[PDB]
Design a binder for these strands. Structure first.
Ligand SMILES: Nc1ncnc2c1ncn2[C@@H]1O[C@@H]2COP(=O)(O)O[C@H]3[C@@H](O)[C@H](n4cnc5c(N)ncnc54)O[C@@H]3COP(=O)(O)O[C@H]2[C@H]1O
Ligand SMILES: Nc1ncnc2c1ncn2[C@@H]1O[C@@H]2COP(=O)(O)O[C@H]3[C@@H](O)[C@H](n4cnc5c(N)ncnc54)O[C@@H]3COP(=O)(O)O[C@H]2[C@H]1O
Lengths: 198, 201, 202, 203
DNA sequence: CGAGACAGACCATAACTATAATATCATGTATGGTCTCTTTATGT
DNA sequence: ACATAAAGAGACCATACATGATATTATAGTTATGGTCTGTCTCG
């Protein structure tokens, strides 16, 4: 709505529209500023309320003054001087980067804080107890060479409730401990084969 | 995840955990809704969705019976292969990277934009005044610096048009020949003083 | 973070169990003990107790009461609760940042549209329009007079006016002094504008 | 990025004027001439001629037609239109970029929301759950077997399975080989997970 | 010199369109409610 | 000591108070096609 006002103010102040001659029709005015008759009349009423034009005759209006349009354009340019717009857009994009940095550090803190865990049911730890007598008891996982012998990967050993994960080749499985491991049904059977718990 | 999915995945997880046996009968809709913080309608929709996958059976207006664990297990494997945290971790990192690339593109765009603009102001108090030094003056045939224009008249010369060729920001050396057009800034008083110096009244 | 009444009851009962105030063998009552204790409605209290019993924290027998079952399960449930609450708080803060950034997006869009309007309205300006630089940044040249700077000889620019506190000092002369944040209006060409920009550190 | 028919008429007529085929003092009709050439209605052609004459290029006279006035004004109008077109296409590009940013932003919002679902699902997931590592970056350790790497001695981790092409190699053993982009599943504690992360070059 | 025809401009309406507001529906929670089951007390 | 009856508590349920989101409708908007009237030019 203010676009038509500033355009007609520029045209009046330029001297193309001198004070005496009548204004163009609202149709031509609307067509020139790529706007429509409805906006046009709204802008003309605004400009009239600024005591710069009088809309008394439907065919056109007689321009009342020139310095008033100059003053209105001065106020608008003081509000909108391009350079002030350049400062505003630069500050605004610096702000843009500020919120992006804040969001980046937030998401980075979130990312580092959380530990990723899985839920694939195929790979659930089966728990088995080694109460039965075995020559394989009193021996280290590395000593028994578990995987080549049974195909099992030991995930944890429960001795007197002392749960230990990723046991390595040194941990020794005592009698009556609970061995937790992965593999398929065949691997589970082989583990019961090695320990004779089947 | 659909609102009519959270309930399905939660119920399937509880079934797979072993809380509900095959012969066991499920609780009421409002029980599930209260335990999973949803409305009874949404819980019912989720139960219907799960029954469409035939983990659950519906032979009663409100009752339901556990049917098979392995099918629910497969449903969990599908859901995990679609959402397993680590894959979401990769997505949340890649989306941040893509947004940073978009911001860099925007920064380059706006920088090129500002470089291309190079715009001037439109101040009406800054409007120039065109005078014609056609009249004889001792001040003709002299350099702006030689005349010392500002102290003498208060005017700041912005341009000396020589037969169409403007000399903007002319400096102290440019010499104003007779009949040239001097363009300058100042107030009405300054314009009068300039006409005083050049006797163009 | 806004939650539900029965959620605030459930977590409170979980902390009470963790505190050890309620014995493992005590039989509590949702209709009278819990409801009277936390001044909440009959079914609300029950909802909380059912949430606890889902996690095997409590056992709910029809017509009898809730019975304490486990301690470490309650501790684990509590810890999961703080983890989920932290995740939700971070989600809310992210959402606030997101809304602010979207609003700043529309702000930038409106600023660009207004600049397009200004650029289109240039057709009716007066010829020989002076340029305008705002000296926001600091340069040794600040706090000096035009004459001390010898501006035309440094940059090729002829200053037509300087803006300080919304006042335009048209036709400045030598004694006039450039100050930080002011708008300097000057005539010249593309080379002159670039030279002035380099000179003022901007 | 789009314009009106009368704007196109005005710019085309201005370019044709700049070509110089029309005289500096030539007269032209509209309803039976410019309208027919561009296959456009008489009033849109009038609109185009009115916007062209508004900047003091042409003069339309009631029931007389138009007369050519200025060349330099036409050139200036062409320059102004080029600048306006550049500004408009830049505006369109900015709008497209912001829309893409907003769509990606909602995507991020939903993605971080779904973490609430995964965290709430943790309460009922089976104990001793292994971790999950996606080896997307390149490490010298890639293309080697678990046994060659001697993984447990390097990181403290026990690998329970590796995912290649949506296939999980449960209970891998030594000959199994880690490949780029695969998911490595392993048991351990916080220290073990951090060690594995440092080893595979994946902050 | 007068009359008729053609062209242009202005007043106008309709169609293609987008945005903004309001209403309705769904997801939700809490409270009031009713019915069933279990436990305790009293009577035979 | 055993059986029956009554009371209390818990669970399943529905409705109302509520808020948020989505969809639809209306209004503001602009452009194009339209018609009528007036003015100017050409021809008789
Ligand atoms: N508005 C301005 N824009 C750009 N630079 C400015 C300026 N005002 C002052 N300066 C610079 O300061 C120097 C001294 O200016 P001052 O006004 O004392 O002394 C000036 C002035 O009295 C006069 N003068 C020069 N050009 C003038 C002009 N366009 N209008 C009015 N007077 C001018 O000649 C003297 C020497 O001028 P010179 O150019 O050698 O040297 C100038 C110039 O380099
Ligand atoms: N799934 C896995 N996770 C982590 N690291 C793995 C691994 N598979 C192999 N490695 C690493 O490679 C080395 C050789 O493994 P390999 O299977 O040939 O030879 C192994 C294996 O036959 C057996 N073994 C050790 N731990 C085992 C276990 N938990 N389960 C089954 N067998 C095991 O003892 C041998 C020596 O074991 P060590 O730990 O000294 O050395 C191991 C280990 O450092």
């Amino acid at each position: 709505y203010q676009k038509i006002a500033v355009a007609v103010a520029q045209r009046i102040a330029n001297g193309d529209y001198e004070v005496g001659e009548k204004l163009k029709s609202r149709t031509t005015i609307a067509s020139t500023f790529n706007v429509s008759p409805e906006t046009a009349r709204k802008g003309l009423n605004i400009l009239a309320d600024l005591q710069i034009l009088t809309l008394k005759h439907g065919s056109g209006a007689i321009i009342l003054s020139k310095e008033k349009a100059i003053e209105f354009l001065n106020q608008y340019e003081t509000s909108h001087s391009v350079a002030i717009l350049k400062g505003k857009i630069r500050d605004n994009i610096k702000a843009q980067q500020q919120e992006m940095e804040e969001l980046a550090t937030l998401v980075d803190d979130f990312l580092l804080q959380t530990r990723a865990v899985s839920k694939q049911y195929p790979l659930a730890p089966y728990e088995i107890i080694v109460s039965e007598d075995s020559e394989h008891l009193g021996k280290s996982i590395g000593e028994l060479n578990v995987w080549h012998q049974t195909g099992a990967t030991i995930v944890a050993i429960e001795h007197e409730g002392k749960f230990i994960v990723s046991p390595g080749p040194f941990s020794v499985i005592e009698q009556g401990d609970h061995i937790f491991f992965v593999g398929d049904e065949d691997v589970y059977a082989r583990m019961k084969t090695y320990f004779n718990l089947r």
